[PDB]
Amino acid sequence: DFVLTQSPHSLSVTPGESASISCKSSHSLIHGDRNNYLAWYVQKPGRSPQLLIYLASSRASGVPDRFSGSGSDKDFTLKISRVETEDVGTYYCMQGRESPWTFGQGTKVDIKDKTHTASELTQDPAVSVALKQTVTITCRGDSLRSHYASWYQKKPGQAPVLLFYGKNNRPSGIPDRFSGSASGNRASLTITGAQAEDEADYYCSSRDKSGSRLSVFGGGTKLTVLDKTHTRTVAAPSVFIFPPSDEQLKSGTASVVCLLNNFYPREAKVQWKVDNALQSGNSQESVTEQDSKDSTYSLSSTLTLSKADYEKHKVYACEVTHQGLSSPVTKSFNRG
């Protein structure tokens, strides 16, 4: 496929001003007789995605003329003069020339307030560290002279998870790679072990002024992971298949597993044949990481069924459709 590049990633401009977003593509988006297949859409939050501009610069019906697109070839631009209130939303660009017609990343647009723009807890937003490395996120404030700070992990569209609070108090379930420290007017949160799932927003919470009944959050910090690839060799898996043990057949369950040992790329489609027929809700999987000894992955596809349903059929199949592999290397089972 061929994708787009949407930048700048986010803008916070004053009302009445002008703003501009640029959308860059891999290859061209032009046909004959001077056409440009690219559209601009706004998703004002909650409301459905709204169409503003289509086919390069053509303005849609009902859209105000302050919206206007430009650009050609592979780089386009969209300008909105006299930005007002409900222009808030994530603006996207969509190509219509190359199938499958894909989207962009989106530009979350915000209105600058210029009123009380003094976050009591200072917190720099851009932080990035390499994989399996250490990084420390700091928080500053006048109230930190006599108060601690709590730390929270915020993944978009989910509940924020409390990570650390107080002197040395860490909740259960929360991994122990998170550690909280403080000194002077500063409070820190250090993630010693770098994992990919730690990529999210991070907020520090404490008081505002020394001696105040209120609490205040920081500006937020978007942590970014910098994972590498090691060796990207399209490598075939090694497929086995195991039957449910007889010790498991003296209970009420019976699971069938399928193994894929040390492969690449990550993509692999496993289709179960309960009896030369697919499954509709009884199969789960699990995968390890790059073993750092061969930099390849793994797979463990489990097919859990009740014992009254296991001894029903006689030929299960684990189908492995890969990229390095060409044919469905299938593994079946019997009982003798």
Add this chain to the structure above:
Amino acid sequence: EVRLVESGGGLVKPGGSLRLSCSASGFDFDNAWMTWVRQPPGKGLEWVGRITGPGEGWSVDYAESVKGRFTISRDNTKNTLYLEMNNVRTEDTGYYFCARTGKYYDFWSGYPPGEEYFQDWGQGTLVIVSSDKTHTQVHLTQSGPEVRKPGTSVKVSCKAPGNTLKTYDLHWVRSVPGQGLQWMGWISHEGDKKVIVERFKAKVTIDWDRSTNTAYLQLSGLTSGDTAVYYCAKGSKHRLRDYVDVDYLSNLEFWGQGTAVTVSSDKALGCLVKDYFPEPVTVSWNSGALTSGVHTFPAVLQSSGLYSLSSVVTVPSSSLICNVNHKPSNTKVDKKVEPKS
């Protein structure tokens, strides 16, 4: 055990009013402090208010950009929390979470107001304040919000009244939070092309029953990564023949309302560790000796609630004990594998 959910969130005109409801269960709500926290879209969290406990006097403290306008109250009988938003502005638009507030105060040194921290959080309701009517362009209606157990089959409907629009090509687009928009598939109004993206080509099915002007979207094999809102959009195109017609997308004009679907994640042989109550368990091979190609697999939460992870290792064909130890449940499980028939 702690369940926090918010409701009452919708759309209110600027200057109107809306009551938010946060139902709690799983702890002692009578003596627990509660805090409201909001987050505008694409921005940062902001402390809104907090209500104290019984002996603490039920006193409430608000933020400056909220004081006097909003109002927080609690009802310890229904175990619910309310935030009454009056004289609402275009600045109060964003997610609204409720959280069980913690009272941290170091004992031996001893200070005056200490700190407040938030232990458990709710999934968050959304409040939108931007006037409009949202119903003047409802030429495309979809199905109600569905909730499915992980792995079921859900069918999303998309219908125009009677026989409204057709010359536009049907498209399906998913809206993932933070990830942005993502094209899924389409059916040409001529009916000769029904293209689905190679990514969604596994579980998704696109159908168009033209006898009643209704579009379908079948979603089997539901995973926790598909929790998103599904929109159907009909748009124009430009077609010109070659050797086999070729189509070029013009735009996506008429959009649907958006069906929100949520899957409830809350409401060489080897060994297997199945049905153990707390995560996690460690597996060392041959009393900590075998490490060549040891592939211990991570754990997953199965339908029973307990975890179940695999642990295998590649063995040569000439040589033809997994020391598992689950301490947070008092179970020493050393075992050895052997085939039999």
